[PDB]
Amino acid sequence: KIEEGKLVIWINGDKGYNGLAEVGKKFEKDTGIKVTVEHPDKLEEKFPQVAATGDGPDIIFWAHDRFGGYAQSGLLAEITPDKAFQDKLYPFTWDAVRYNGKLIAYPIAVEALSLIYNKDLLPNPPKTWEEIPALDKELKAKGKSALMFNLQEPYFTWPLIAADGGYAFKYENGKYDIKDVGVDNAGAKAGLTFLVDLIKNKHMNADTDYSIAEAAFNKGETAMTINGPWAWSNIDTSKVNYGVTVLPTFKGQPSKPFVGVLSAGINAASPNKELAKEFLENYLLTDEGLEAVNKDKPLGAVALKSYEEELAKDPRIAATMENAQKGEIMPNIPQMSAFWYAVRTAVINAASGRQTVDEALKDAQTRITK
């Protein structure tokens, strides 16, 4: 029902929680206050429950998309970083941590899709989507295929659909305009159509899913794939000589993948708000703090400029941040749930011929703005 005089922190089991425990130890010796870190199962489902009764951790770490609902219920306190501290992190990350204009969490890390290719089959990866058809016919002459990635889930195909104009919800003046949806505009249709032409002309198969695409790439059958940092581990084992780079352009516009920002929020019920702020701003969000967490489990690309510049020496991390800066911050509003269902159906329908491109998107759009 509080604790007063200490800090309790929650973070998921797949993150560097032992490394975060170490930043906590440094805090205790410099100030005398104890910090304890915990990683309970399905913690993102528990928080809403215990927090509603005035209980739970003082601060919680999770992808920014879930904090929208939390803030809606008044579970998060408004943070007060001054203009100077805000200057230490890339500007676009702050747009992922606000509900109704108010800052409700500190950005930590950044994640997004990238183009991954086989250097042995393709020493020069394509810069454009338009080039792919010809590259495929060319590689087929030796028994290989150009590209294979998950066509079942919209999170994986949106980068292409969004490239020339698509977007979920318009973001402006620090707020999302629930009525300005971009799924049936010219750009979105052009993108979905190029995707459908790939399938019809036999360059891709409508059934291809996550596991099927990963295997083909790790088996050296296909020259490229589209995936996140969570897949690098497996490619390392496959022994394929791969590279991770900027996504191809479409109609000269950059592909726009969704961006997930690991963030730290403060319980509105916490009697330790000043301690939390001091800890997060002056201990965790420093080159020394993120390094400690990273050493445990890689954070990937980070929001802190100074440290990201060091990390950028790894071309894979440099690519992740590049595709992220060119991508679309995932909206944190409730209406976003309607988006997924409407778009998922639209893409599966167009790929199967069950429905045309122009008609699939029209219906999705009508559905979301409903």
Phi, psi and omega in degrees: 000019181142222179169322179050123179088004179211179179227133177242129182237141179245134178208147183295152181298345179265005180257169180284071182290339178281325179290326179288328179298327180288325177293324179297320179294321178295326180292315181299319180287334180273338181232341180093349180274135180276145179230128179237132181253137180228149179228065180295155180294148180036051182295334180289345179263332179285314182314308180306327181285301180294325180294327180296338180260005180090019180240187180106187180286162178285324178223147180230137180255125178191161179308139182303330182304330179278341181289343179299315179291319179302311180297325179304320180274003180073026182276347181244142179274151179285126180275157183237040180296136179283170181309323181294313180296324181297333180288346180281346180243151179307130180314315182297340180288329180293338180283352179265347181248038179223138180237121182058042179082337181275132178290125182235015179182159179260126180287138180247299182233168181227137181223141179196162178291156179216168178268127180242130182227162180266103181305332181286327179266333184220081180294345180229089180297143180299142180269343182229153177291324181306325180290335185305314180309312180293322180296324180293311179301322180296313180289332179297334179295349178234014179085014180242167179238153181288306184220145177208121179210166182300114180258359181279324181250131180303336179299326181276332180263344180303324180309317180286315181298326181278334183323306182263022178143348180285151177197157181278301180220135181292127179254131181201152181041037179073019181215151179269130179267095181311340181261350181257086181257137181245058180253344179240025178277175181306313181301313180300316179294320180298318180293316180293327179293321179295323179295316180293325178295327180298314180296312180299315180283012177069021179272342178215162181243132181302337181277341181310125180236187182308298181300319180297316180292318180300316180299306180307318180289316181288346178263001179070017180281322180244141183287340181212161177207172179232117181202176181260181180298335180295348181258344181308317180312313180292322180294325179302317180291324180298340180073009179291139180276083183261166178224154179238123183221180179298141179294153180294155178270163177224125184053036179074359180259142180296149178291149182237084180283154179291149181242127179253126182246110178296127182226160180244121180247156180252124179304128179297334181274352181293127179276008182242036182299323179289323179295319181298315179298311179303316180295308182295313181286319184254001179233305180290306181279060178223166180297325180290324180286310180293330179297315180299319179290310180308314180306327179286300178217126181308130179276345182083229178273144181244159180283335180284113181312306182308315181283321180302322179300324178288315181296327181306346179297340178270116181302333180291317179291321179300321180291317180303312179294323180297310179295332179288317180294334179267352182272190182246117178304128179299126180293142181262010181270153180308319180307338181299336180293324179294325180303308181307307181300314180296314180288321180305309180300315181301319181286318178296320180296316180291322180292330181267355181078356179302342181196153180285167180292305180306323181280324179299313180290324179302312180297318180299309179306311180302318180298318181285320181280359180300000000 
